[PDB]
Amino acid sequence: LRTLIRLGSLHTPMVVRTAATLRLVDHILAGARTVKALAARTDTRPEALLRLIRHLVAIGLLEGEFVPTEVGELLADDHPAAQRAWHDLTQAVARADISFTRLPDAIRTGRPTYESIYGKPFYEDLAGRPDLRASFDSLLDQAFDAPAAAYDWTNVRHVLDVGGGKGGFAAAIARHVSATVLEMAGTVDTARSYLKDEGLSDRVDVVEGDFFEPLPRKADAIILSFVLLNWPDHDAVRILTRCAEALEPGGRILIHERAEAPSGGTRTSDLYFSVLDLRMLVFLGGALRTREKWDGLAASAGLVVEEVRQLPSPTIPYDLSLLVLAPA
Amino acid sequence: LRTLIRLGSLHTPMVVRTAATLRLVDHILAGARTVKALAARTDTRPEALLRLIRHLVAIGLLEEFVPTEVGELLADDHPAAQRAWHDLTQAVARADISFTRLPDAIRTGRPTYESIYGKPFYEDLAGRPDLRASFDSLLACDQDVAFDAPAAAYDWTNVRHVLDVGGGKGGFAAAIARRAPHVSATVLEMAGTVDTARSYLKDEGLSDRVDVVEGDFFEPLPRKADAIILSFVLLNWPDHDAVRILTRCAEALEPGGRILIHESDFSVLDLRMLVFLGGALRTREKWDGLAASAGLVVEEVRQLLSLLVLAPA
Ligand SMILES: CC[C@@]1(O)C[C@H](O[C@H]2C[C@H](N(C)C)[C@H](O)[C@H](C)O2)c2c(cc3c(c2O)C(=O)c2c(O)cccc2C3=O)[C@H]1C(=O)OC
Ligand SMILES: CC[C@@]1(O)C[C@H](O[C@H]2C[C@H](N(C)C)[C@H](O)[C@H](C)O2)c2c(cc3c(c2O)C(=O)c2c(O)cccc2C3=O)[C@H]1C(=O)OC
Ligand SMILES: C[S@+](CC[C@H](N)C(=O)[O-])C[C@H]1O[C@@H](n2cnc3c(N)ncnc32)[C@H](O)[C@@H]1O
Ligand SMILES: C[S@+](CC[C@H](N)C(=O)[O-])C[C@H]1O[C@@H](n2cnc3c(N)ncnc32)[C@H](O)[C@@H]1O
């Protein structure tokens, strides 16, 4: 009974997320240990903040003066795992997680619930909210060293990174190759700034546009890193087809995502990837795909999976893959 | 890191609550172990139900899928009633969505339920007979035994009549009537609830000893009594409202009468009161002040939870 109640408790994660959002652990580490000072710094009502703190003590994140535990220290804004931002309700991902309150609808329909809560589908909501666009892009350790090392660039003149975020993958590849990042409004500006500040602006450019439209140029390698999981099969096939049509002769499409058999691993990795797969369902109608589902998606786009390079890791983000696709 | 991610995960409790809402474990126990059959019984999309099942396996509620010993606690007939307490169509798990706006409650000290559902808690139940009934059944889910200890924490020898103010389905009045055959009692409750209290007390064979009045415990109470009961009532109310209720009870005491308040690290219950109702759990010193504002004094406290016995000051 205690196990079930713990698994089912909605209050504990919302208390953690509220503490992250209020930056409570940052304020304590900066010398606000008392409720009166912490209530001033967080702009909260002191009696209610103490009731929040009581739960944070009960679950082991805090211990009239309060300090973080070793686990609570991970909510410090400068901790390398960045768990404060990933739990911050004002930033894109924990905000999107509220969509899980309508999880029954998503299981009933297979369709995302984010629009029903926030008024627009995911990327269109970000397009109207520059703060959320920027926090989404910053949330997504630019992590691309191993996938860049898993491909032979000898015969590659130009790389097109489709949906390439702030440009970290293109940069890892750059470190004879030139590259282009294709991205959405807003994101293109932070990609350009990142690439300039890496000293790579003469090797990597950035184009604003829509990867459902004809791609801006041809390339020898076209990258889809954590893109296709955001889309249902029919959209994923459209993106793959745009990429296929943009390949130079002998070119390849590189997919950087999860591509395992549905077995193996541990309950810990099972859980971690269950969360990602369910986030794609609820936020976007997308999904993680097994190695076998990749074969079918590829065939619908006129492609074949030529090779799957394993990118192992026993710790988060665990084992990933680089799939290499060629025209069929 | 793993501990923090587990504590912070909204996904797992919503997967549990979705399984409870879909009555998934009941359908498995009733023969549907495969996704095709379970999708049909739950009226869900099979590929998405499988993704839900994968999470339920990873967290150890399921393991052709069958419930684990923990998952079996989501059977609808299990006496701890955890399926209904996690059911998003019933009152409490529905109210728990208020926690998605917990930062607002911490900022203001005010409930977030009305901002989500359009009306404050008891007004919403008053317009939704299904939610009113499921709330009453959730709290009364063990009322045949849960009031034996508070009833035995008080001596009924010189009590003639009991008034249970906000008495739910009547379980406390019934436990007192079984403890003390000489007492009569009255339950005061809201619309809807009074009908299921009347039915419960009739089916206990107590209808000649316990009656039920529909009314509002912020108004003059319907009669006087030697013992007036407030069981898990005052925690629903901010201080000024709790004082009003206590004062109405004080006005209705017979000479020599007493008010009985029936009310681990509880932070969940306290935060639920904040977000649902603006209420709170109270420590002893706070009870002393509330009592004093209503013209009362705390005469004795019995550990059971507690039973506080209040007398006119
Ligand atoms: C923490 C691991 C990872 O960063 C992997 C994964 O993180 C990315 C970036 C990450 N970063 C260090 C650049 C790293 O390269 C990793 C291998 O890939 C990932 C994550 C999360 C999301 C997403 C992720 O791709 C999303 O794509 C995503 C999205 O496209 C739309 C909405 C939400 C999300 C995500 O929440 C993360 C994840 O799997 O969390 C369980
Ligand atoms: C699970 C423990 C408990 O049943 C204690 C507590 O439940 C106890 C006492 C309760 N009572 C009728 C004696 C009953 O016997 C139940 C099975 O166990 C409790 C609970 C929950 C509520 C409430 C609780 O009292 C409420 O009163 C309540 C309310 O008045 C209005 C809105 C919501 C609620 C509640 O959600 C529960 C709780 O503390 O959850 C954290
Ligand atoms: C940030 S995630 C993956 C980013 C990056 N490739 C990585 O691995 O971290 C998916 C990206 O697809 C982009 N995107 C979504 N729809 C798009 C579209 N129609 N055209 C171009 N980019 C799009 C989003 O802006 C987002 O940055
Ligand atoms: C169910 S909880 C506690 C019930 C019961 N005494 C117990 O211990 O389980 C609080 C009760 O207060 C009742 N209540 C709320 N506002 C009321 C009001 N103004 N007048 C009478 N009853 C009210 C609700 O209907 C609800 O049943």
Residue numbers in the entry:
A (entry chain B): 17 to 79, 84 to 160, 163 to 164, 167 to 199, 203 to 355
B (entry chain A): 17 to 79, 85 to 284, 296 to 297, 300 to 338, 347 to 355
Quote the paper.
Tailoring steps catalyzed by SAM methyltransferase-like proteins have yielded particular insight into evolution of anthracyclines and generation of structural diversity. DnrK is a canonical S-adenosyl-L-methionine (SAM)-dependent methyltransferase that catalyzes 4-O-methylation in daunorubicin biosynthesis. Recent studies have uncovered that DnrK is bifunctional and catalyzes additional 10-decarboxylation as a moonlighting activity. Here we have taken advantage of the natural diversity of anthracycline methyltransferases and employed extensive chimeragenesis to probe factors that govern catalysis and substrate recognition.
Next, we introduced R1 from the 10-decarboxylase TamK, creating DnrK TDDD. The region is reminiscent to CalMB in terms of length, but contains a Tyr residue instead of His at the key junction. Activity assays confirmed the importance of R1 in determination of reaction chemistry, since the 10-decarboxylation activity of DnrK TDDD increased with all substrates, particularly with 5 (35%), in comparison to DnrK RDDD and DnrK CDDD. Structural determination of DnrK TDDD was carried out to explore the significant gain of decarboxylation observed by this chimera. The structure revealed that insertion of three additional residues in R1 extends the α16 helix by one additional half-turn in comparison to DnrK and DnrK DDDD S298 (31). However, the longer helix protrudes away from the active site towards bulk solvent and is unlikely to have a significant influence in catalysis. The positioning of Q296 in DnrK allows access for solvent ions to reach the active site through an open channel, which is blocked by F297 in DnrK DDDD S298. DnrK TDDD harbors Y299 in the structurally equivalent position, but the solvent channel remains open due to an additional interaction of Y299 with the ligand; a hydrogen bond between the tyrosine and the carbonyl oxygen of the substrate rotates the side chain of Y299 in a manner that prevents channel closure. The residue Y299 is fully conserved in 10-decarboxylating enzymes and mutation of that residue, in TamK, into aromatic phenylalanine or histidine revealed the formation of hydroxylated products 9 and 10. It seems likely that the aforementioned interaction of Y299 with the substrate is required to prevent closing of the channel, and the disruption of the hydrogen bond may lead to a rotation of the functional group into a position that favors hydroxylation.
